[PDB]
Amino acid sequence: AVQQNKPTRSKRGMRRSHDALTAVTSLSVDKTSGEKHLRHHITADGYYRGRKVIAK
Amino acid sequence: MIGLVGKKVGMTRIFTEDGVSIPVTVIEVEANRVTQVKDLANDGYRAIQVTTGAKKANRVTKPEAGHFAKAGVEAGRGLWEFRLAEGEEFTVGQSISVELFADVKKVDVTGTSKGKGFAGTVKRWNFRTQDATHGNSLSHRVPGSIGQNQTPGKVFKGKKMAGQMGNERVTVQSLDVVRVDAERNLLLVKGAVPGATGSDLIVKPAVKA
Amino acid sequence: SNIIKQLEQEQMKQDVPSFRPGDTVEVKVWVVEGSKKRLQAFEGVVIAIRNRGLHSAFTVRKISNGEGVERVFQTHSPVVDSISVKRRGAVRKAKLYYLRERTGKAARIKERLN
Amino acid sequence: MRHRKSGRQLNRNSSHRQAMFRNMAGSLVRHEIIKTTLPKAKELRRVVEPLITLAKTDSVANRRLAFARTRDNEIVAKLFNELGPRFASRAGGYTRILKCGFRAGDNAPMAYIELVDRSE
Amino acid sequence: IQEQTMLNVADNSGARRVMCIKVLGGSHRRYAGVGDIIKITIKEAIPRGKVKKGDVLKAVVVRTKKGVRRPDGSVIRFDGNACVLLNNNSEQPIGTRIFGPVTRELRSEKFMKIISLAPEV
RNA sequence: AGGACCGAACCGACUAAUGUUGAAAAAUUAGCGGAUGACUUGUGGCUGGGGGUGAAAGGCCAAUCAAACCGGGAGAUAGCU
RNA sequence: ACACAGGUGGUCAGGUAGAGAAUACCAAGGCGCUUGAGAGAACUCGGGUGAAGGAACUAGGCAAAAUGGUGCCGUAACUUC
RNA sequence: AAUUCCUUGUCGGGUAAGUUCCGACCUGCACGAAUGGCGUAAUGAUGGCCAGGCUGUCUCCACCCGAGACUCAGUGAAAU
RNA sequence: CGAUGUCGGCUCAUCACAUCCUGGGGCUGAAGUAGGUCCCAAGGGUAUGGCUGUUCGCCAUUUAAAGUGGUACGCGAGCUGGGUUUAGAACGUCGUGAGACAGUUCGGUCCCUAUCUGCCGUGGGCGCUGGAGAACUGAGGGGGGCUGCUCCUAGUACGAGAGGACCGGAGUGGACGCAUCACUGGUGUUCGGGUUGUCAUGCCAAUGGCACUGCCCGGUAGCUAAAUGCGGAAGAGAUAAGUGCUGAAAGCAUCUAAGCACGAAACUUGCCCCGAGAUGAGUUCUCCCUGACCCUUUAAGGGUCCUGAAGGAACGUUGAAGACGACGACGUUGAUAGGCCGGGUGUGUAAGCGCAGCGAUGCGUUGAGCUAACCGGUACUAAUGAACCGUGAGGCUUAACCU
């Protein structure tokens, strides 16, 4: 339930070796407006693949 | 003797004339195409690698496409192997599948079993649950002891605990062949074979027989 | 599937008459003692399945010698060669378990194709 | 464990799911585009598209069935007068899910679900 | 059928209600009776009968609420569990007449005599 | 009529489960006992520590009781750690 | 010690069903309890249903299940009547 | 026997089987008459035993519905 | 003693052999059946209850047998808390008394979110020497290993009779394990219906909310056991106890010293599963990449431009796969999911209208309406093309095959 010896900062970093964020590294570019977006998502002005889908 | 690769169509019933109503599994066995023959010169053993079914030619990668392009190109859903021992058979992909099972009487069917996920000890092994009500703080389906105090001081390397159940290769042995249909590409065997509907089955003649 | 129900339809029998639950039917079944085989009749009210293809079964409940005998039969089995309509009963539901666990109460008859 | 089963619990009981989807189906029929989460949009597809399919045929019995569902006479009237004949030549797919960003208060994958042929 | 199961009695000299106290055969036979032989104490009897209340003997299960399985897949169930009382040594029926239906699983050896006395098989 | 009966408010606390770094330094949930009486409760008063009070358990006396708490003798004493 | 599942005296007392201040659904009125979104493993907690058997469980019928209302009939040993 | 060590005394009943129970015997280690003796209707969240009903208590677990546990975002301890 | 929780039960076990059963034998005061004793052998198996807190013991009934021990008299950061050693009370006894009993009796709080090791599962990274996509080999490792009864041989051998075989075949069970959902069932708060109280949709009618899914009645798919299939073997090899052949030492005898032949559920294989991180990193098949320079301390590299290949990953639709990762299918050249259509199923004759009746209600339309996770189809909706990662012929030495 409790520890008998303090884990060192080496073992702390070894456990956090998999606690690492991954980036998108590839944004899609819409074909009507040149702005970028997440793949398969609305293009933050209301564009999907070539169509103005949401007016706001 | 070599076997074949089929898929599990499902289970049904064969009503015989005496009213015996034997439970059968239907295995669709399409024609197996010998894509490779392995001998004692290239390898240390003799076998045939076959394929079955079809793939849509866009999910076939270029190494797979070249491997199928050798020895006659009809791509299949996978590749399997059967080791062959004494009899010699010629090395082209067969036209009718189940005609070598037409004269056998019992088969072993290997299939990837249905996955039960993370299963407990009571499901995975046949562990007795503890008491439901006589006291029993928080300990009904949990495992009890897992060892023997200080003298081992450890848990042994084969201890039955919870974990992944199913989703594994498993063979049911000596299943009686009920019907062989060359025209419908069907093998009806008596009983239940591992896996779900549409899963691949390696069906071979019985080694215990 | 399509591969199955081909086997089921080539094993199914087409001589099965129309029955509803609450009907009192008589079922002739083949019984075998030695080398001889004969027909034995089982008569009673029906707690049916509706047609599950080849895997169809009707329950028939009888009172034979003072106690209830409940027997299901597979409809397309070869041991069941004749099912006779006999009485034609009138109930409101599909399974008659509550309407059989009591004794001395019988299903009524109506003539609206029941 | 969970084999060949449909329906998301969405961490609520069945009566709350039914009332929540009655409300959200009424919101979709009212506004013709709403913003919800992605699982609550796919389950909304499963709830809303049978209503438009029911409302393709105009009967008193169908109006009472589509009022027993969604419990809103204005939603029934719109569903049987504007929708229905609008989607009469369509065979399914009356709604479209467009994946959107993420919610600010919690990282919820959002989605706009809308009627496919909006007259706007 | 199972241990502590209270069964009715099909024959006449055997009387009224009995209790299964062992399932004969096997190391741990758990729930067993189709035409199987069980060990019996007697919980209720009649003054006329050949057996008293509280003596151990054998019996064969002739009717079971769980039922039997026919080879074609069909089931023959009964309302209530019944048995025919049998002697300990020779395993002969005590009774001279059998009441109620029996089942065609009961055709081996002495159960020929039981179904010969039985009304419906 | 009744230290009557059943049963809410109210008073209590027999069993079980949960909680045991709790939602809570004793509670919650499902039942449970009394419920016109030796009942229960508000407000105020009185009894003060070898003392009080106790249908009595050494119970209770401010989460403290085989002698309360605070301050002092006091840096008691400690052949013990 | 907390924006704490506890404690805190009195007063008001709607509709329908109901003996009822029980209980259920609602008035007037007030809230959704200051983390959400998914997914649908073990295991834990709180429940629902179970074939056949029916206390074989266990220290022990612990727990659960069961019975449950009004009117009428009927009701034993024993008794301080 | 809230009392008996030997002791699971012995006999009878209950059970297929009963160190507990009930009725006796008296061989009371070591009951006994207001430290009260024996009995006693009613009463008891009292102790032991039996039976009917009832059931997941069990044979022997199976499925389902919710709150967690698992993943994601925000905040963020503890014993040691 | 700045704390190593104590009996018994439950759950889970693991080892020893001084073996309970099964297996193989020697002697018998072994006719046969059935025994007695000893040797070998640990592969598998090795009860349920009544009483008691009990281990044990006795009893009842099974079984092939209900083994003996070690494991902190195995197992309390797994459970219980009946026993035992807290605080209350009483009895018997002792004490004048407070109190006490290797006496009894009733009641009496069992905490811990796992850091390390150890296990059970499941991933990420790098390595395996150009990089990929698959299929394998099998060094190792694990699982499984039980057995009753009946029939034939044969009422034979044997035995005065009674009784009753060995060896060898066949069937059918019990326990156990694996798989599965065709059957029979359970569940099925996502399907349909009945019904109570109340509230609401203006009201009737029809519905909806709440009351445990309000209470129920059935029930699809999935999961499941009680359901249904299958399995533990045969055969080898080397043996233990034991039995021998030939055969001297020792002219004989002698299973042994040389040589040779049998011999068990033990051992190695045979059956099933994992398995090249087997760093000893293996094998086979297939695919892809064969451009310009510049600087240089060269047991060698570094940089710029051009080009990103095989393939993978990411994203999305998802799955009888799954905690998350992983694995599988599909992404418009498309049936991957939802919808839709048709069927199937499951409830049980919807609503509205008409008729009969004073009415509740019944009858006709009508096996109606609704119907899930099922089946067969169908691009209606969503699966966008980029983009990302991964490069540009792959070291040294030696030996063979080549000019």
Beta bridge partners of D98: D112
Instruction: Calculate ∠ Cα B15-B18-B19, nearest 5°.
Output: 45
Token pair belonging to B92: 């082209």
8 Å CB contact between B50 and B77? no
The secondary structure of chain E, three-state, reads CECCCEEEECECCCCCEEEEEEECCCCCCCECCCCCEEEEEECCCCCCCCCCCCCCEEEEEEECCCCEECCCCCEEEECCCEEEEECCCCCCECCCCECCCCCCCCCCCCHHHHHHHCCCC
Strands C68-74 and C80-84 turn out to be unpaired
The 3-state DSSP class for residue D28 equals helix
List the single residue in C64, C67, C77 with the smallest CB-CB distance to E74.
C77
Q: What are phi and psi of D29, to 5 degrees?
A: -70, -35
E6 touches strand H (CB under 7 A): no
Q: Which of residues 28-87 of B touch strand I (CB under 7 A)?
A: 36, 38, 42-45, 47, 49, 55-56, 58-59, 61-67, 69-70, 78-81, 83
Beta bridge partners of B28: B7, B186
How many CB atoms sit inside 10 A of residue B118's CB? Answer: 11
Amino acid (1-letter code) at residue E21: I
B61 touches strand F (CB under 7 A): no
Q: Which of residues 85-114 of E touch strand G (CB under 7 A)?
A: none
CA E52 vs CA E41, E43, E70, E116: distances in Å: 10, 9, 36, 26
Show Cβ contacts of residue C39 under 8 Å, excluding neighbours closer than 6 positions. C28, C29, C30, C31, C81, C82
Q: Is B126 within 8 Å of chain C by CB? A: no
8 Å CB contact between C89 and C72? no
Domain ranges for chain C: 1-114
Strands D95-102 and D33-37 turn out to be unpaired
Chain B residues with CB-CB distance to E71 below 8 A: 19-21
List the single residue in A40, A44, A54 with the smallest CB-CB distance to D112.
A54
Beta bridge partners of E75: C72, E69
List the single residue in C3, C8, C79 with the smallest CB-CB distance to B19.
C79
Q: Which are the residues after which chain C is interrupted (C to N > 2.5 Å)? A: none
**What sign does the dihedral D55-D59-D63-D64 (CA atoms) show?**
negative
Chain E residues with CB-CB distance to C71 below 8 A: 74-77
Beta bridge partners of B205: B107
List the single residue in C65, C77, C79 with the smallest CB-CB distance to E120.
C65
8 Å CB contact between B141 and B176? no
* Mutate: best of E70, E72, E74, E104, partner B, most B CBs <10 A: E72
Q: Tell me the CA–C1' distance in angstroms for D10 and F74.
A: 70
Amino acid (1-letter code) at residue C99: L
In terms of residues, how long is chain B? 209
Which chains contact D through at least 3 pairs of Cβ atoms less than 8 Å apart?
Answer: A, B
Token pair belonging to B8: 């599990």
Between chains, do E67 and C79 touch, taking CB under 8 Å as contact? no
Amino acid (1-letter code) at residue B80: W
The 3-state DSSP class for residue A17 equals coil
* Mutate: best of A24, A27, A43, A48, partner D, most D CBs <10 A: A48
Instruction: Calculate ∠ Cα C46-E102-E74, nearest 5°.
Output: 45
**What sign does the dihedral C81-C86-C88-C93 (CA atoms) show?**
negative
B192 touches strand I (CB under 7 A): yes
Resolution in A: 3.0
Owning domain of residue B132: 1-209
Domain ranges for chain A: 1-56
Q: Tell me the CA–C1' distance in angstroms for B1 and I116.
A: 53
Q: Tell me the CA–C1' distance in angstroms for B65 and I288.
A: 13
Show Cβ contacts of residue D67 under 8 Å, excluding neighbours closer than 6 positions. D73, D76
